[PDB]
Amino acid sequence: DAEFRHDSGYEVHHQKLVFFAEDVGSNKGAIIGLMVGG
Structure with a gap:
């Protein structure tokens, strides 16, 4: 049973990685x- 959630707000980046x-x-x-044996 997995419950994974990612909610983005205000993000400014060259690179971003989210790994679950x-x-x-x-x-x-x-x-x-x-x-x-039995």
Whole structure:
């Protein structure tokens, strides 16, 4: 669940970057390689 918001007012710039990220190169809460005998 992501809630991202950007509201601009009065901005004067040569360059501007707004970077919002969550899961970039990730395996959050993943199961990888599990053996259960029972």
